[PDB]
From a paper:
Here, we describe the crystal structure and enzymatic properties of Xyl2, a novel GH11 endo-β-1,4-xylanase from the pathogenic fungus F. oxysporum that also exhibits a synergic β-d-xylosidase activity. The groove delimited by the long β-hairpin, commonly denominated the “thumb” region, and the curved side of the β-sandwich or “fingers” region defines a long, wide valley into which the xylan substrate molecule binds, or “palm” region.
The crystal structure of Xyl2 at 1.56 Å has revealed an atomic-level view of the active-site groove from which the catalytic mechanism can be inferred. The final model contains the complete amino acid sequence except for the first and last amino acids (residues 2-190). The N-terminus of Xyl2, however, adopts a particular conformation and, instead of running away from the active site, it folds into an elongated motif that forms one side of the active-site groove. Since the position and orientation of this unique feature appear to complete the fingers in Xyl2, we propose to call this unique feature the “pinky” motif. In the observed conformations, Glu176 side chain points to the bulk solvent, which causes the side chain of Tyr72 to concertedly flip over to a less hindered conformation. The present structure confirms the poor activity for Xyl2 at this pH since it presents a concerted change in the Glu176 and Tyr72 rotamers, with the nucleophilic Glu176 side chain being kept away from the substrate.
Residue numbers in the entry: 2 to 190
The structure:
């Protein structure tokens, strides 16, 4: 029902999705800059990056302030197989990987990441209502700026049998779910 607003800004791909537009303000700034402010009802996800994604190093910085269900993550999809993946850098009052099956750990970029897989059934995807897996790398030491070696995560996932398909988009995403929060982030390489 609800398509993400997508396009280009500042030399980056961007995607912004919400099922409740009046609850959220998403703004594209210059270069890799974007901001999101949300509160009250609804599910909101937005950010800037690359279409398609690859094993690139992603640098980011800025301010991320969650007040409830929320995450800051490198966020992307693959196809064949259909995979929604997350490299979670920060989050609020609730670990988004909750209920994921833990597959291992990876030490990269100055922290250990816990690796999980979950299945989502009959859910929205880059290919409509589908059943797909979610891959999670969740940073134990939360942060709001730094560098993410996505290839190191992809390889770590592979080493525990979480194989990826062909890349679709890859963004630095800020997400809120029936919560409040705000962020002002800048992506780069």
């Amino acid at each position: 029902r609800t398509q993400p607003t997508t396009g280009t800004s500042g030399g980056y791909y961007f995607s912004f999705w919400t099922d409740t537009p009046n609850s959220v303000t998403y703004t594209n700034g210059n270069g890799g800059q974007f901001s999101m402010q949300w509160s009250g009802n609804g599910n909101h996800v937005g950010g800037k990056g690359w279409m398609p994604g690859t094993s690139r190093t992603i640098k980011y910085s800025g301010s991320y302030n969650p007040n409830g269900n929320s995450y800051l993550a490198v966020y992307g999809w693959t196809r064949n197989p259909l995979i929604e993946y997350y490299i979670v850098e920060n989050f609020g009052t609730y670990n988004p990987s909750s209920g994921g099956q833990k597959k291992g750990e990876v030490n990269v970029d100055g922290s250990v990441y816990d690796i999980y897989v979950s299945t989502r059934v009959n859910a929205p995807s880059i290919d409509g209502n589908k059943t797909f897996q979610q891959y999670w790398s969740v940073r134990r030491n939360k942060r709001s700026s730094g560098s993410v070696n996505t290839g190191a995560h992809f390889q770590a996932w592979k080493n525990v049998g979480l194989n990826l398909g062909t890349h679709d988009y890859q963004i630095l995403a800020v997400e809120g779910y029936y919560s409040s929060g705000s962020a002002s982030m800048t992506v780069s390489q």
